[PDB]
Design a protein around this ligand. Structure first.
Ligand SMILES: *[C@@H]1O[C@H](CO)[C@@H](O[C@@H]2O[C@H](CO)[C@@H](O[C@@H]3O[C@H](CO[C@H]4O[C@H](CO)[C@@H](O)[C@H](O)[C@@H]4O)[C@@H](O)[C@H](O[C@H]4O[C@H](CO)[C@@H](O)[C@H](O)[C@@H]4O)[C@@H]3O)[C@H](O)[C@H]2NC(C)=O)[C@H](O)[C@H]1NC(C)=O
Ligand SMILES: CC(C)[C@H](C(=O)N1CCC2(CC1)Oc1ccccc1O2)c1ccccc1
Ligand SMILES: CCCCCCCCO[C@@H]1O[C@H](CO)[C@@H](O)[C@H](O)[C@H]1O
Ligand SMILES: CCCCCCCCO[C@@H]1O[C@H](CO)[C@@H](O)[C@H](O)[C@H]1O
Ligand SMILES: CCCCCCCCO[C@@H]1O[C@H](CO)[C@@H](O)[C@H](O)[C@H]1O
Ligand SMILES: CCCCCCCCO[C@@H]1O[C@H](CO)[C@@H](O)[C@H](O)[C@H]1O
Ligand SMILES: *C(=O)CCCCCCCCCCCCCCC
Length: 326
């Protein structure tokens, strides 16, 4: 008997003591000490203080510099919006609920936070995928007579919205469900409960295949062929020191991006491999949600990697932060 079941929630704590309470009604201080909820609050505060400026500044600097408004950069703006969904839909709400020690907005707010937090994270996920596909098309030139235009970049953005809705919306209609997860202060997809009435098992498989395996294969294929194409072309121009420098930094950046993607991706795979095997034992509120606890940080380091390290964005932000000088 691992936890306590109830309508619209699963508390990862046995009720044999009788101390369990609804995560919508009363604080869950048997799951964790109050200071650990405070540390959860401090972590959300860290993510808000670092996440909102970086992502809002990305939207703001784009308004001040014409050179940034390239179609290849539209997907990076879509990434910055998605992170803001995570920052205001998820991190802000969770900071507030954390300090109460339970999800005070009830099951209705659970679907709101769940949707928008899941939507924001999903849009970011597919934006990284779409950027990889866009860069692969532009460099490797797989189509004979193709030019990447404004119309094409818009489809890529809309495509993320469709994919993110494909994951964040079914839990509201009847396929899986949103419940308080971990310490019960935030809400998300329910892969902790084999809820037959919403076919949780089929949604977890669909999530694992479409939104967890496909994004990885695409990112690895696109960036692989790109580094292959770039290293192939540079080999024909070894007389050019700059071409070799460009090839080196492109390879280094692709590695950083792919490593970063794996840092958010592998925890969910290690924890799941601890569900395919080692399935019997109960999982504390921390363990099932260790991957989530660190995947939230993507709202900070993804704009650092994909935007802050972009050569044009960087100088423009310095100019904007410095009131036009330097
Ligand atoms: C996890 O485990 C705990 C412990 O079992 C559960 O908490 C119990 O929840 C039940 C509700 O299902 C509570 O029972 C109800 O208590 C009400 C309040 O009683 C208090 O006040 C009276 C004086 O009025 C005291 O004598 C008593 O000791 C209590 O302190 C009662 O009003 C309810 O009675 C009504 O319903 C019953 C049917 O259950 C009828 O027979 C009555 O006539 C009346 O209509 C009822 O007795 C119980 O008090 C809770 N216990 C504790 C320790 O909190 C969790 O709900 C459980 N599940 C989770 C968390 O999901
Ligand atoms: C963006 C999130 C909404 C998105 C997610 O929250 N998840 C992935 C699928 C999910 C549930 C959680 O389903 C799985 C099945 C087996 C192993 C791991 C699994 O993760 C996600 C997080 C990190 C990386 C990619 C996507
Ligand atoms: C931006 C930060 C706002 C924090 C608002 C937190 C308000 C917490 O409010 C407290 O919640 C407790 C339950 O945990 C109650 O028992 C207390 O009576 C109540 O004061
Ligand atoms: C590199 C990938 C970028 C996207 C990472 C998004 C991480 C989102 O993390 C997810 O948040 C959801 C809502 O809080 C929860 O339901 C999930 O448990 C959690 O894994
Ligand atoms: C998902 C795709 C990631 C592509 C990462 C490719 C990393 C290649 O890395 C390169 O491999 C060469 C092999 O000859 C070495 O000689 C180079 O020193 C090294 O930079
Ligand atoms: C050392 C840090 C370990 C942290 C493991 C996860 C602890 C609890 O898990 C967290 O609970 C929160 C409250 O519901 C959720 O909002 C977070 O998504 C979840 O990661
Ligand atoms: C020019 O490029 C920049 C103009 C001068 C800015 C100097 C001030 C930067 C302060 C950033 C660090 C603030 C830390 C606050 C911590 C809460």
């Amino acid at each position: 008997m691992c936890g306590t079941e109830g309508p619209n929630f699963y508390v990862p704590f046995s009720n044999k003591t009788g101390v369990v309470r609804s995560p919508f009604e009363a604080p869950q201080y048997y799951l964790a000490e109050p200071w650990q909820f405070s540390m959860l609050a401090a972590y959300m505060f860290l993510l808000i203080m670092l996440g909102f400026p970086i992502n809002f500044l990305t939207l703001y600097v784009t308004v001040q510099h014409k050179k940034l408004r390239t179609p290849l950069n539209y997907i990076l703006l879509n990434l910055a919006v998605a992170d803001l969904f995570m920052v205001f839909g998820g991190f802000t709400t969770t900071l507030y609920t954390s300090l109460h020690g339970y999800f005070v907005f009830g099951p209705t707010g659970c679907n709101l936070e769940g949707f928008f937090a899941t939507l924001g994270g999903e849009i970011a996920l597919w934006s990284l995928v779409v950027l990889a596909i866009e860069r692969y098309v532009v460099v490797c030139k797989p189509m004979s007579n193709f030019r990447f235009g404004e119309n094409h970049a818009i489809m890529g953005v809309a495509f993320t919205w469709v994919m993110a809705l494909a994951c964040a919306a079914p839990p509201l209609v009847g396929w899986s469900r949103y419940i308080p997860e971990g310490m019960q202060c935030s809400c998300g997809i329910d892969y902790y409960t084999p809820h037959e009435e919403t076919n949780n098992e089929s949604f977890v498989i669909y999530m694992f295949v479409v939104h967890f395996i496909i994004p990885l294969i695409v990112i690895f294929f696109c960036y692989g062929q790109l580094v292959f194409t770039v290293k192939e072309a540079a080999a024909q121009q070894q007389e050019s020191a700059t071409t070799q420098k460009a090839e080196k930094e492109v390879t280094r950046m692709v590695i950083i991006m792919v490593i970063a993607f794996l840092i958010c991706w592998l925890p969910y795979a290690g924890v799941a491999f601890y569900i395919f095997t080692h399935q019997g034992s109960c999982f504390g509120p921390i363990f099932m949600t260790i991957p989530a606890f660190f995947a939230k940080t993507s709202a900070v380091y993804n704009p650092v990697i994909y935007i802050m390290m972009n050569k044009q964005f960087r100088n423009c932000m310095v100019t904007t932060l410095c009131c036009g000088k330097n």
